[PDB]
Design a protein around this ligand. Structure first.
Ligand code: K
Ligand code: K
Ligand code: MN
Ligand code: MN
Lengths: 196, 196
């Protein structure tokens, strides 16, 4: 059984970059729905697996991926943001970034392009390629989780589903991305990075 | 060269079912972007085709489908709605609906389920299967146009991208769908139906 994680900060803590209304809806409505559906889906999957119903297991894949991905992605997202975030990373993460992207700004540009370029709903990710030992940028459709579908270890995720910015930035996705850099919790990204 | 079609009614004509703000953004921002990108993409495709650059043609497919689909889908959508719409269809369309779905209400339920069930961004469609001679409900991801990807002739489309309802209905997609039935231009759906 999975559960909706508590937000490490107040809903209005990311003001004015991400308003309180979006944070409240995103967390208490969208994320909550993913968790509940995930639990219901894992429930049905245990039954199908117990009696060897292969057709049932395959029919459930879309729901498990979508809701499981939704839970995974958002849980990471909440920790990637902080009212005390922003600025630039320091230490080994900054070195790894300059080394694989040229500079911190070229990195911002690459991640922003990948996020703005998502056709439809999806996520822009900064991940770690364990096999090659270097950072890597990827985009995922809908709620497809980074690690489960590409093998990359997630470090920083940017949600570009319209519900993550529409109430405040309307259709101007680039304005949303420009603003989110001010609340990125580089301390958390560093932890995830040191862990792998 | 394609162009943004004029709206057959005022931006606030669908009040209170779909507020003026969404209609204005949806048409003058979202649809306009699709048309402009479509023109730019067809431009590049003519060049690649002229010099037989097969790699260029394949690299352009995502953009042409996404923007071309966006133009096609929305152009049809605007005509599917009307300040004088709502109610139930009459004539051959109502007979075809009762015949293939049991009743008008079972049809509403089926189309609503397909639209609410779209994981991520997409469209719910009521189309005509020319090979089997019957109505059919389908859902399409992102901006994939109905006819170009499934062969079904579109009759009625319901946009479930979050930008089509978030400002007014937030995350409650079912409320948006419940309300749109009040502005469906059954006269237009009937025309598209009689045409095939
Ligand atoms: K959990
Ligand atoms: K045209
Ligand atoms: Mn989200
Ligand atoms: Mn739309």
């Amino acid at each position: 059984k999975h559960s909706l994680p508590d937000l490490p900060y107040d809903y209005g803590a990311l003001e004015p970059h991400i308003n309180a209304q979006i944070m409240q809806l995103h967390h208490s409505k969208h994320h909550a729905a993913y968790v509940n559906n995930l639990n219901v889906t894992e429930e049905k999957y245990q039954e199908a697996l117990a009696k060897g119903d292969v057709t049932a297991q395959i029919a459930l894949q879309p729901a498990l991926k979508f809701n499981g991905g939704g839970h995974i992605n958002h849980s990471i997202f909440w920790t990637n943001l902080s009212p005390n975030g922003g600025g630039e990373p320091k230490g080994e993460l900054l070195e790894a970034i300059k080394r694989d992207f040229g500079s911190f700004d070229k990195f911002k540009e690459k991640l922003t392009a990948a996020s703005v370029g998502v056709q439809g709903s999806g996520w822009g990710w900064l991940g770690f390629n364990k096999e090659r030992g270097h950072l890597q940028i990827a985009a995922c459709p809908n709620q497809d989780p980074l690690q489960g579908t590409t093998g990359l270890i997630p470090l920083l995720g940017i949600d570009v589903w319209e519900h993550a910015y529409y109430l405040q930035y309307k259709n101007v996705r680039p304005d949303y991305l420009k603003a989110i850099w001010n609340v990125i919790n580089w301390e958390n990204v560093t932890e995830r990075y040191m862990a792998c």
